[PDB]
Symmetry: D2
Subunit: 198 residues, 4 copies
């Protein structure tokens, strides 16, 4: 039995939708238990409301210290100027206690992301990899295992580093079927590796 | 005539000390006005106090929209697992309004950092560059203009991407004279470029 | 000279490698943008081929490129250099890497220190286009180049209605897995923007 | 075979380029660590030289490497590959870049998909050692390699009393601007840790 956490932040729902597909893929691996949780909001109340932040997410809020309860963690975040979101950064800064005891060492990790225009989607993933490496995570990219990555006929997210979605500058674009298939592939892929190492 | 902001976060003082050297270098350029400010704390009170956070920093707290009041900005941050600190990330996440109007486009930017063991010092700088590029900053590395970078006889911070210091895992190491000289070089180099573009 | 302040031309080199022509087309747009800046002299050159002849021929490499081949030493003759390369698995091409590996002498004398640099790229499917540029930035930083991204100055970047290259780090084009895609008008406009933007900064810094 | 279930050896390739021997010494330690893991077969090979003869000789290139030269196609013969390269301005060496550019056929067939990879590096002064590793990671990701950093599993990474190589991304050594430094005992311990760590994961995934 392997336990996977799908841990995400989502302000406008795009990452939340992708996380559902990530989790669906992971659950295809027999013997893998998948939990979806989100990191707490950090914006002050007035700014958050002014920005139209959503409060309908059913996923429970995770605590920093519980990450070591899992065998693999798939991290999801919207970009903030080519980095992970401040919400995810602040959450991961609180894992110093886990880092000092080696509590996450040798566990499996993978990353998915979203952007408004595609700009920064690659760097959001690989700069999250940096933090994973300091913890000693085994890092799983997806390469071109997802056949959708070869199709450039239409605006479509997804990179060899991990699944992505493109929300549009105004957030009007919802994740496409191809993007969700890439995320489902990533989830199952990370789950086969996590189960095999357990 | 030109205004430079040295904007930093410092929890244990190492970055604050480096910022003073950064500013000293910038003030060597005639006609350049240099201001030092810090980003607000984001840690909750109990964790911050339990962590031994310092409250003696004289620099005023900056606001996100004031960044456009300057012609060049030199950013300073300790690493959090190879990224900028959550404090700096959260602060810069609030610059979306400046980004939408192009308010920082074409300004000069440079970065310095600190780490406990040296690990992640390079990636802290260049993952901050990613955010600067999304704003359209002109990005200034220092290369090997600082002669101290060739001396590897002893532990010493500083990279071709920007000045750094090494604090030790317990924070007992203070910035060396060589590290501070590299920061002084960086400050003057950035200021010269900023003044020349004005 | 009595009564004269010399007016010196800022010099831009567009330096590229292109196997199937996509980067070559972009470089023309980069150069077109730079030539919009008065007082800027623009040169286009390419790096030498490094593949062995049989592999190159089997891969269908193009040999009709009119641009002269640059030498590593002449990089110091310019005030700004805009580098173009196709990706190789998310890095610059081996051809460009080999060429820049020969600039150790320029590095030791600081010959490129303080010059302006910018980067554009191409990929087959989009994968690695961002990293190709920013991992080229790393080498530029070791030389002390001032690094110029383009941000979202080009309005084309906000239009996600169709497959289109162009990043805040620099212009790109998407060639298709088989290389059958040609640079679109929008991608070329992003490259024209980059050239003019870089040329303006180089001229002002001169 | 009646009553027998085959025990298959996991295979590790330590693949490196070394101009002045620093990476070569590190590769020996990498391999030593891997051979500590039972059930792992360890091979050390190098990538071919790409510099022209006169430049190579003028630069003092070493010709005493006993490691046989690898071909790009044989990478698919292994379960895990630990790559070693000196930096060239914060990237992998052109020699390694040229070698990996020839793996397009393996990439198209997915021949390296799901294998284990890890990276070690060297620099003259420390500058760019982190980016050398993580920009090599990019290429590994395009092939679908599982990427293994070392984190802070090696206790030597906490000792900042002296100039020491090694990062959470992989082992490194610092050669000095003139190349006169040799890998220290601590740096070699980190490399031995990396080899054993990668070998354990490769054996478990097999
Ligand atoms: Cl979102
Ligand atoms: Cl600090
Ligand atoms: Cl091309
Ligand atoms: Cl070497």
């Amino acid at each position: 039995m392997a336990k996977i956490l799908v841990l995400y932040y989502s302000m406008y729902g795009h990452i939340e939708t992708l996380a559902g597909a990530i989790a669906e893929g992971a659950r295809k691996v027999s013997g893998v238990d998948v939990t979806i949780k989100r990191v707490p909001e950090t914006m002050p109340a007035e700014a958050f409301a002014k920005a139209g932040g959503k409060t309908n997410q059913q996923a429970p809020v995770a605590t920093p210290h519980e990450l070591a309860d899992y065998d693999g963690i798939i991290f999801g975040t919207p970009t903030r100027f080519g980095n992970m979101s401040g919400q995810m950064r602040t959450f991961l800064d609180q894992t110093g206690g886990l880092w000092a005891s080696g509590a996450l060492y040798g566990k499996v990790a993978s990353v998915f992301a979203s952007t408004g225009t595609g700009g920064g989607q690659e760097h959001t993933i690989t700069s999250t990899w940096t933090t994973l490496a300091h913890h000693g995570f085994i890092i799983v990219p997806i390469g071109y295992g997802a056949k959708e990555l070869f199709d450039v006929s239409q605006t479509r997210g997804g990179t060899p580093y991990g699944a992505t979605t493109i929300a549009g500058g105004d957030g009007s674009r919802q994740p496409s079927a191809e993007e969700l298939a890439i995320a489902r592939f990533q989830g199952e892929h990370v789950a086969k590796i996590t189960a095999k190492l357990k």
